[PDB]
Design a protein around this motif. Structure first.
Motif, PDB file in Angstrom:
ATOM      1  N   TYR A  22       0.809  -1.243   0.081  1.00  0.00           N
ATOM      2  CA  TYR A  22       0.061   0.030   0.085  1.00  0.00           C
ATOM      3  C   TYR A  22       0.771   1.336   0.066  1.00  0.00           C
ATOM      4  N   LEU A  26       1.803   4.719  -3.355  1.00  0.00           N
ATOM      5  CA  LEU A  26       1.617   6.007  -2.893  1.00  0.00           C
ATOM      6  C   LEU A  26       2.625   7.031  -3.626  1.00  0.00           C
ATOM      7  N   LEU A  76      -1.621  11.428   7.838  1.00  0.00           N
ATOM      8  CA  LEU A  76      -1.635  11.215   6.336  1.00  0.00           C
ATOM      9  C   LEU A  76      -0.199  11.064   6.202  1.00  0.00           C
ATOM     10  N   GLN A  80      -2.437  10.655   1.272  1.00  0.00           N
ATOM     11  CA  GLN A  80      -3.367   9.922   1.428  1.00  0.00           C
ATOM     12  C   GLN A  80      -3.570   9.227   2.562  1.00  0.00           C
ATOM     13  N   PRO A  81      -4.566   8.578   2.997  1.00  0.00           N
ATOM     14  CA  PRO A  81      -4.469   7.735   4.357  1.00  0.00           C
ATOM     15  C   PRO A  81      -3.340   6.887   4.872  1.00  0.00           C
ATOM     16  N   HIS A  84      -1.809   2.493   8.628  1.00  0.00           N
ATOM     17  CA  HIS A  84      -2.725   1.674   9.688  1.00  0.00           C
ATOM     18  C   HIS A  84      -4.056   2.391   9.724  1.00  0.00           C
ATOM     19  N   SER A  85      -4.331   3.449   9.222  1.00  0.00           N
ATOM     20  CA  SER A  85      -5.567   4.055   9.160  1.00  0.00           C
ATOM     21  C   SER A  85      -6.669   2.948   8.151  1.00  0.00           C
ATOM     22  N   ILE A  86      -5.938   1.979   7.907  1.00  0.00           N
ATOM     23  CA  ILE A  86      -6.459   0.968   6.650  1.00  0.00           C
ATOM     24  C   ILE A  86      -6.283  -0.479   7.342  1.00  0.00           C
TER      25      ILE A  86
ATOM     26  N   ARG C 226      -6.867  -5.963  -0.027  1.00  0.00           N
ATOM     27  CA  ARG C 226      -8.064  -6.121   1.135  1.00  0.00           C
ATOM     28  C   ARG C 226      -7.890  -4.561   1.804  1.00  0.00           C
ATOM     29  N   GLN C 227      -7.551  -3.590   1.229  1.00  0.00           N
ATOM     30  CA  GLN C 227      -7.485  -2.175   1.597  1.00  0.00           C
ATOM     31  C   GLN C 227      -9.125  -1.696   1.668  1.00  0.00           C
ATOM     32  N   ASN C 230     -10.760  -3.610   4.620  1.00  0.00           N
ATOM     33  CA  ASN C 230     -10.361  -3.041   5.802  1.00  0.00           C
ATOM     34  C   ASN C 230     -10.764  -1.718   6.124  1.00  0.00           C
ATOM     35  N   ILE C 231     -11.223  -0.949   5.029  1.00  0.00           N
ATOM     36  CA  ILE C 231     -11.669   0.514   5.218  1.00  0.00           C
ATOM     37  C   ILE C 231     -13.021   0.537   5.536  1.00  0.00           C
ATOM     38  N   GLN C 234     -13.071  -0.110   9.323  1.00  0.00           N
ATOM     39  CA  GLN C 234     -12.872   0.934   9.974  1.00  0.00           C
ATOM     40  C   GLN C 234     -13.702   1.937  10.227  1.00  0.00           C
ATOM     41  N   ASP C 240     -10.169  11.969   3.781  1.00  0.00           N
ATOM     42  CA  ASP C 240      -9.075  11.261   3.093  1.00  0.00           C
ATOM     43  C   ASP C 240      -9.278   9.800   2.979  1.00  0.00           C
ATOM     44  N   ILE C 241      -9.826   8.949   3.655  1.00  0.00           N
ATOM     45  CA  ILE C 241     -10.068   7.596   3.632  1.00  0.00           C
ATOM     46  C   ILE C 241     -11.046   7.605   2.532  1.00  0.00           C
ATOM     47  N   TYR C 244      -9.907   7.901  -0.840  1.00  0.00           N
ATOM     48  CA  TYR C 244      -9.046   6.724  -1.292  1.00  0.00           C
ATOM     49  C   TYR C 244      -9.960   5.625  -1.840  1.00  0.00           C
TER      50      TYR C 244
END
Lengths: 296, 301, 296, 301, 301, 296
Positions: A22, A26, A76, A80-81, A84-86, C226-227, C230-231, C234, C240-241, C244
């Motif tokens: 991921y 980016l 950020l 982008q996110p 670990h936000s994902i 699996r983003q 997983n989002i 979340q 931002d997320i 994305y």
């Protein structure tokens, strides 16, 4: 008999390289490979070994990005996110660690005796520097400039000098380019600090509670004022506060101060370059342009 | 000049090792170095190389504790607070990863090439293990049992085998010990599992904390998969319950599923396998090893 | 003697109709009555019974709006604050339930034997569909297209088909308009899904963790990634997320896919309409315009 | 075609009834069907229509539990976790409202018209009851006592009366039983109230949880209104305290106000009313009913 | 006109004093008025001026409690809930600051000019005390011991001295009592400190709450500064731990540092100083005071 | 001997004046001194005593700003971060209290017998008013207009009338200017209420849960509607909600109502001024301009 030791599938590598994959999707201002190439103009590492060293340093960067993002409470990454936000702190952080080990496996392909000792002493210095960085974050102890610059010569010097030490150890040229990459990394860090408050998240290492270079100047310049250090302690996601803090640090002339320090440092790195060049190495235009990109 | 690079000081080490030191001023169950003694009956590594192998495993393990306590979101280590409830997860994590660096630096003292292949391949596997564990946790989808066992072979076998493989490396005997030590690791974790839910552990690592944390552990996998059409337990894991009543209910349910009997009997068959293997080794120019079975017997309920 | 059974005042009806009254004061693109009228052109329900059926379906809609808003962790309704942001989960949800019962009382005025059995089987299918919808939300189990479309044929089919089944049961015309309202409701839902990510809160059913139609296509198309799932896990209030996630679902061509599915479905609903019309019913221009409004 | 509509499956029912089933694998105090027996002494509904009336009330009640546990923010039902701490308030709420649909579908098996008027008017009143309760909770303004009693007549009388009115409906005797069963419901809730604060309940539904939740309950209304100029208790409700010390203080205060004596004496007068009414019925072509007074006596402290 | 100004009513006072009244319906250790009696043996202020001095100190103290409980983030006062867990920190704080106004209004009843200088200089010092305390708390930097003692002289000496200085003011004897009463205040707070961590206090003001709140208290300062290179305790304070295990660990550590012995011995030397001073006063035209040493002895462990 | 009673340093005054010093560095529309000066045109307090009275009233204002900001759960002060967002509730609030005592010390320089009794009765009325203000905030009891206006005649009347009572007590002119400052303070408060919802945080005393003047009119006008009072109870940081609330209060005509009340009140304060002036005092142009500034 009761347990059949199953093999490592590619779907599970995929699961493990995920926070990493991921991060690698980016786009970012890759300055690390640029630093390798501009120093290669002096070292001339063969292309197989140079490929390997590039691979490993890139892996290490993305892995510590994951880690540090977790440790900084960053939000950020490259716009982008943040990883670990994902995937969450756990998965993403284990994936950091996993790539550390995969990079160690990689280094082993350089099949050079001194590679592992260098990789080690670099990780030692990495965590030495960011250790004290945190020890200060968590204690509300504003360090000195000298203390901050020693910890930076650890923490950023870590992967910068790792790239270059691996190259020096894979080359024919026994010239100590590391007291220069040390200065270049320190500069890159001070620059990164400054831009985090005066650029275009907005002041995100105030939210991190960091004791960055202009933050330290601002705090120590007038100690009698404890608003800025208390705002560091508040770790503020609000922008009213962060903006007040920018205000106070302007009123103290710490961005002026930092730009002056960066100026004198680029001076030292120019003389340190011109020395090597005036000891019989080809004129490096690339590192001049690269050092130039560190400014704002 | 302007910047004058200076040296690392001892006060600073003390700061870097502050979480790790703490975690090491805490009484442990010793079961790493004991297994090393059990095998050194057979490998007979010199005392000095062994002293190093033992510091390397002691380190890698205490670090693994520092870091897992954060990843798992644990509340108590060895009955005392987790380190990160004293230093914060940031310093506790950097202190872990620093000690990992320290072990890699130390394992070079063996001056043994094959050892670095061993150390790497291990850390690699350790993280493949914790990775599949985390992956089945966050996805809230139950592995199978075979899947769980492979994950454990990686995660918990990755340091049993590191110690015994470093030993084999410093030895010169041409006998593979590793299937046995892997088997012992799988047993150690199945036991560890049961014990998390069924031994007054409940004072060391909290009342069924394998529940608060949401691990699909060996008895939990049994109970969940045994009545697929009943979702209470897997849903319970989802809710990651700090509450004692919920953990009590899940325990009661898990009894209803004859899952702790299942566990005991699996550990029975596996101990049979571990004996048969010690015996098959012993029967091949090796000494009757007693401590190696004293420890296997001290894995028990 | 010690207890005087007091009567139901109007101030207490006011207290109980409050989350509901509130929702009914907020202007919205009422498409439900439009669907009743355009189907009435074929059924010709008398105006007393048609009044009653309109009342009840409207009550049921607003009541389930209250409920579902609570269950979705929704924030905004028709642009303005969502009911329980004002009265709280409890009061608003009991008011949902209260209006369910008041609507049952209403249905009873149709004084038709089969009305209650229809109302029931509709509520049964409603909660059957949104049950599985949640069972998937809470489990992080991405369903199939077919599974999603069966649950939609429950959950939205519920009040659509309730309106129409009541009308069919109050008319003279014994033509099974329900295999058509089923297709129309499925389409309306897929449309509602698509618009929730590509329109003008921003992607609010990502925050809900929903497995909506394009989200399912995106997730299953590349499972190796699996983003997105997983989002979904979340439940992100950050933009931002969500942005994305829009990015990733574009990169997979799932809005293309959904528009194609909607196209083929509108085709099936056109042929399904033209069949009834070519079996001796007046040309329905209204339902053509209504179906047309489902597109973007 | 494209979409092919398929059928509901049994696994899916199991998912839909997962919160409700759970909540029903939990031991209850049976006091619904017991009251039905008490009255069927007099109504003598056939065993089959009674079996249906009993499933309808059992359902509507277990559903009401599922849903009230979320609305009230309760922590334990029947000493075990609330369902929504296992399935989540979303699934627990949909499972409640589904079972309500299931009861409406079931109550048609009576094939009795007046029954649907009864069922409706009931659910209507049940929600008028819970509505005024919630309204005085969220507004943090104390009802009076008469106001509380009317609210209870709605909320808790709405299913006592549903069962007994469905019975009357399937019977043919022309005697109103409903004032008595309403009276019994008011007693059941006043008792329930006292017992929430004064019986070791404290193990089933938590240490004074009627406090954590902030209900203006019958003794709470007494204590609050008795010394208007002292705000500690109503303010305490505001703070919705999960903490045990605060609930202890409020209990102590509430004793200081002679509120539990007040409660006991009110339940005394009301039991006198319930007896006098059973006796007045009995004295009119009816049988001496014993279970009907066994249950009234089993409402007691 | 339009607006017609009306009068303050008694119900309204009851609202304003609702937190303070509550906090005063709570059993206290009386140690303010006792010290006043101890000194009035010597000062012999008339009963009426004394009644006023005593209401002024009783007020200023109960108010100081109301307000410190919010500033410190305390959970229990006198074993009962803090007022602000019943009325909310807003009303509890306004009720505190109102009572401070009430004391200033009351202290005028003395009709004594020098008294207002006294009252002011006091409140001033009280806040300089709580200010340096808060400042070392929020900065997470340990004072020294001398620094702690000066802060205590301000904070806790500021009302011991207010009472005794108001007394001196209403008296006519020309003997300074204030160094002694300051000394007694420092002892009262060192004792208070130890007792917060070492007396089953743990039931009144919670299990080491001086830890949850993060005060650098006298034994905490000793333990922290005794092994500077060990950060667990100061880091523990940072984490402001509501958890009992963390407070247990910090207590154990603090024993390891021989900090409670240190405390006891300091309080020993200081009691020697307090005696020597009572004796030196007494030996100068004053009476053998017994209650003044009964109270000093009742400061003890 | 074991304890050396150390002296009060200036670094510790600095630590204690910090939340206060901070508040005093933030520019604001100082209307308090303006009110003193425009009333001085009638009183003619000597310049030493008038200096002292100005100092004390300013200290009291900033100190209660700190306090009330804490008690209101306020976020922004004069556009910038509210004091305790930097120093924390504890430190900032103790600093409020500290300045209260320092101001008492100040008042003592007026070396007038009646100064302390006036300062007291003012603090008594201050906390009497804001006490009931909170008693209502916390109880969800909407007061009356008359109740609100009595509490305002306490709470704002407090420091307004403190300034003026100190001046009257330091002057030669025994004319009761306080029934006028009472009306002026009430007006200033109603104005402050109105502007908090219709101006340019956005509706921040809805977030505070306040029963401000137009909020009370809106609530009592239609009691049958309990959305506004429930939104007061929700203490909303969301702007969708606050904006809905502005909507509802417009739909009730409470800003119309408040502007009318302000109009009639400015009328009463004009006649109350013209009376004093037509009893032999110089025409006050300043207070006319000051009263004029209260309007929007």
């Amino acid at each position: 008999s009761y347990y059949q030791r199953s093999d490592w599938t590619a779907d599970e590598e995929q699961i493990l390289l995920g926070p990493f994959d991921y991060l690698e999707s980016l786009p970012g201002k890759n300055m690390r490979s640029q630093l390798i190439q501009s120093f290669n103009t002096w070292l001339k590492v063969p292309t197989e070994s140079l490929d390997v060293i590039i691979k490993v340093i890139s892996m290490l960067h993305t892995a510590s990005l994951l880690i540090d993002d977790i440790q900084d409470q960053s939000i950020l990454r490259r716009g982008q996110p943040v990883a670990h936000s994902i995937f969450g702190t756990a998965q993403a952080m284990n994936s950091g660690n996993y790539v550390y080990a995969l990079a160690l496996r990689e280094v082993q392909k350089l099949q050079n005796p001194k590679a592992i000792s260098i990789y080690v002493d670099s990780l030692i210095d990495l965590h030495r520097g960011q250790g004290m960085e945190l020890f200060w974050r968590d204690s509300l102890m504003c360090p000195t400039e000298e203390q901050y610059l020693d910890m930076v010569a650890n923490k950023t010097g870590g992967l910068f000098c790792l790239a270059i030490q691996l190259m020096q150890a894979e080359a024919t040229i026994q010239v100590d380019f590391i007291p220069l990459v040390r200065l270049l990394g320190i500069i890159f860090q001070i620059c990164d600090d400054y831009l985090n408050l005066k650029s275009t998240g907005l002041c995100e290492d105030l939210t991190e509670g960091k004791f960055s270079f202009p933050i330290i100047h601002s705090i120590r310049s007038n100690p009698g004022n404890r608003q800025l250090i208390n705002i560091l302690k508040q770790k503020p996601r609000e922008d009213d506060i962060k903006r007040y803090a920018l205000s106070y640090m302007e009123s103290t002339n710490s961005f002026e101060y930092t730009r002056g320090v960066v100026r004198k440092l680029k001076t030292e790195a120019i003389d340190t370059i011109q020395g090597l060049e005036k000891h019989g190495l080809e004129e490096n235009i690339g590192i001049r342009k690269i050092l130039a990109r560190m400014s704002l």
